[PDB]
């Protein structure tokens, strides 16, 4: 359920990287396990950037979300990445929102700014985003 392509966004989120959950679905933090579309290499850890759909497990949250594996989208990251128009940009924290394969967000609201790359790729996130930075 992903629309269009994405430019190069340097991936600052690894395997076992912990991110916040900006949704309101009782899940606090998710730790990245794998990244959808990742092309494997020897000894390389999976990498995720803004707008990258990941597979993550919830280690902190309500019982219906903890100790389970969900699917998320990185909406902001602390890694500095460069836009194609010579704009260097980075956020304050790494966060994600739970989506399914078809792309519809599980939650109903997002707290904090949402990067443009995650907003363009997923139309459902941009509809519920406060601001698109």
């Amino acid at each position: 359920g992903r629309q269009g392509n994405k430019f190069r966004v340097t991936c600052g989120l690894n395997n076992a990287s912990t991110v916040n959950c900006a949704d309101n679905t009782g899940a606090k933090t998710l730790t990245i396990i794998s990244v959808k579309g990742f092309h494997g290499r020897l000894n390389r850890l999976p990498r995720a950037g803004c707008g990258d759909m990941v597979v993550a497990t919830c280690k902190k949250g309500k019982p219906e979300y903890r100790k389970k594996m969900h699917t998320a989208v990185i909406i902001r990251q602390r890694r500095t990445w460069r836009r194609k128009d010579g704009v260097t940009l980075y956020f304050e924290d790494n966060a994600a929102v739970i989506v399914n394969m078809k792309g519809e967000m599980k939650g109903s609201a997002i707290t904090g700014p949402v990067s443009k790359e995650s907003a363009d790729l997923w139309p459902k996130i941009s509809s519920n985003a406060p601001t698109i930075v």
Partner: protein, 388 residues
């Protein structure tokens, strides 16, 4: 036994052996395939790298999601003062390759060309081309020259002009010229020699050789690094911290029983001064005539291509220049052999029109803020100096 896990080999076997070159100038291995159904023209040039800046260019491709305000890209500035054509040579196709038949030179030759033929000029008698010039107008020598022209027209297939640079126009301390043979691709051998004769003693500027938004091939010698280990040379994996005798090496240099170390293994050695050819490089600004400045249709302030404080380790560019998108092989002051593309690129990005929106001229040292020193003075205002 088989290796447990598979991975691509480190380093290319197409660039083996890694032998450092002897001359700074790099000779092109070929010229674009000749077509006999067009006017004669030169298929190459030669310039000196100045430095690197960045430009904001307006995207002209369609069906692309690039920003509409412009894309930040790097450029390389290659100062290319005019060349002096000082002869020409015809090549014949034999069963062992092209064989130079004769070389015909002009009457007047500059000391920059004569410096190539010695190794201690200040102790030489500097009598190069003396007999060729003194007896240029004699009846016997004129007949000989007329035979060289007719011999080439009869028994030759390739004609090249021996053009050399003028190093009094560049900030380099070297005085001897840089000779390069530029093949003439065009009409029949009859009209190729006619064009080559017309160029004798004349000057060729880069605007005549290259067009606008043209993709070219660049051949140059890379930046030297010296003796380097396997980690830098090839990119092997560093060994664990626990390792005895060192970390930055290849653990296994071959199996027991080919009984010899293979040429395919990574060994420490020279990295650096190699000759590399890069193809399909677009021209952004043809710095000839009006476009010798750095202003654009959107940014109209009057400024030259040299950043504030001069190009680092190079100086000030005040002659014709090229604006090549991206990087070329070699550091500043290197000699770059340009060339028309052997395989012309047909991609939509190769045919795209280049519209520069901003050309950077801020100082290439530190975190600069001002484009021109006049607008540095305006913003800062009068200081303690020049006020008292």
């Amino acid at each position: 036994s088989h290796r447990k896990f598979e991975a691509p080999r480190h380093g290319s076997l197409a660039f083996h052996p890694r032998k450092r070159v002897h001359k700074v100038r790099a000779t092109v291995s070929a010229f674009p395939k000749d077509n006999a159904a067009e006017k004669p023209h030169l298929t190459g040039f030669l310039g000196f790298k100045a430095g690197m800046t960045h430009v904001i260019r307006e995207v002209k491709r369609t069906n692309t999601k690039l920003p509409k305000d412009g894309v930040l890209e790097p450029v390389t500035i290659i100062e290319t003062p005019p060349m002096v054509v000082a002869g020409f040579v015809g090549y014949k196709k034999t069963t062992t390759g092209l064989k130079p038949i004769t070389a015909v030179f002009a009457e007047h030759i500059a000391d920059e060309f004569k410096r190539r033929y010695t190794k201690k000029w200040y102790k030489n008698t500097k009598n190069q081309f003396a007999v060729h010039t003194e007896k240029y107008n004699d009846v016997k020598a004129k007949s000989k020259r007329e035979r060289q022209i007719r011999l080439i027209k009869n028994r030759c297939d390739v004609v090249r002009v021996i053009a050399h640079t003028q190093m009094a126009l560049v900030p380099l301390k070297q005085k001897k010229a840089e000779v390069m043979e530029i093949q003439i691709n065009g009409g029949s051998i009859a009209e190729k020699v006619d064009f080559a004769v017309s160029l004798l003693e004349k000057q060729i500027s880069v605007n005549s050789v290259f067009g606008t938004d043209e993709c070219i091939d660049v051949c140059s010698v890379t930046k030297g690094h010296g003796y380097n280990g396997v980690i830098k040379r090839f990119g092997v994996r560093h060994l664990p911290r626990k390792t005895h005798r060192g970390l930055r090496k290849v653990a296994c240099v071959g199996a027991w029983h080919p009984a010899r170390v293979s040429w395919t293994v990574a060994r420490a050695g020279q990295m650096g001064f190699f000759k590399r050819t890069e193809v399909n490089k677009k021209i952004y600004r043809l710095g000839c005539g009006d476009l010798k400045n750095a202003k654009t249709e959107f940014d109209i302030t009057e400024k030259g291509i040299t950043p504030m404080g001069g190009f680092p380790h190079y100086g000030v560019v005040k002659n014709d220049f090229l604006m090549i998108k991206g990087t070329v092989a070699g550091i500043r002051r290197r000699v770059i052999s340009l060339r028309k593309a052997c395989f012309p690129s047909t991609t939509r990005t190769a045919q795209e029109q280049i519209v520069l929106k901003f050309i950077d001229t801020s100082s290439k040292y530190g975190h600069s803020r001002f484009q021109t020193t006049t607008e540095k003075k305006a913003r800062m205002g009068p200081m303690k100096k020049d006020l008292e």
